[PDB]
């Protein structure tokens, strides 16, 4: 069944035993160090046009909490930036730690944030999501960090739905939600080519990591940690620490849209 997780027996360090590409040369996430970032004067701003009504479902698959969107036609689009054409929003999910002092997958100048939100988009010119996974630029992920601060009203909508998907395999209708309401005002970003941070770890992703964090309160973060990685018919296992350690940067440059 090729089951994997975040534990010592089935974690990141063993993923290559199931998917060789986990040891590839374009793996994510990475540590962003000021010493290896290059300002690209040609980088252009990106934008999004999300239809709140395209949101369909929220689910707990035992590895994270995912909100799924209708991507059968052009409804919710991401355009601009380093991209060659518009991308369709497929879903978003989160990565978080066991406590407020860590949780993000990407790290900036040696600092980690409480969580990392990933909005996954794919290029419709490739016809299907499965085909896009085979392309070096088939998927585009807008990554945003969560920092502890004031409570985020818009984020509560999501947190209020988690009670319906407490365990692995649960799913519930989640309608009328515009993920853009979670975006910080500042749009500065870093971009680089990498992979999915979860198996099969396909190296088909163009990353857009925003510089400015979204703030959320500690009580809000505690709510996320209330999920279980186990199914109803299983002994309780809290869903925390679903982040992959930084991978080698190797022969890649991270471009910044700011000087
Ligand atoms: S809540 C986030 C922002 N959306 C809106 O304000 C609603 C606009 C819709 N047209 C509507 O239903 O009124 C938003 O789009 N933020 C992203 C941005 O780039 O600022
Ligand atoms: S990147 C800093 C942010 N500015 C913008 O996103 C641009 C705003 C206007 N479109 C413009 O001046 O061109 C920002 O507001 N960051 C928030 C801050 O005050 O911390
Ligand atoms: Zn992710």
UniProtKB/Swiss-Prot annotation:
The modification Phosphoserine is found at residues 28, 42, 47, 49, 54, 218. GO terms for cellular component: cytoplasm; cytosol; nucleus; sarcomere. Expressed in liver and muscle. Zn(2+) binds at residues 93, 95, 118. InterPro entries: CA_dom, CA_dom_sf, Carbonic_anhydrase_a-class, Carbonic_anhydrase_a-class_CS. Transmembrane segments: none annotated. The modification N-acetylalanine is found at residue 1. The modification Phosphothreonine is found at residues 72, 128, 215. S-thiolated both by thiol-disulfide exchange with glutathione disulfide and by oxyradical-initiated S-thiolation with reduced glutathione. S-glutathionylated in hepatocytes under oxidative stress. Keywords: Acetylation, Cytoplasm, Disulfide bond, Glutathionylation, Lyase, Metal-binding, Phosphoprotein, Zinc. SUPFAM superfamilies: Carbonic anhydrase. It catalyses: hydrogencarbonate + H(+) = CO2 + H2O. One of its GO terms (biological process) is positive regulation of cell population proliferation. Induction: Repressed by 3,3',4,4',5-pentachlorobiphenyl (PenCB) and 3-methylchlantherene (3MC). The modification Phosphotyrosine is found at residue 126. It is found in: Cytoplasm. GO terms for molecular function: carbonate dehydratase activity; nickel cation binding; phosphatase activity; zinc ion binding. Residues 63-66 are annotated as: Involved in proton transfer. Substrate binds at residues 197-198. Its cofactor is Zn(2+). Reversible hydration of carbon dioxide. Expressed at much higher levels in the adipocytes of lean Zucker rats than in obese Zucker rats. Expression is higher is the adipocytes of male Zucker rats than in female Zucker rats. This is Carbonic anhydrase 3.
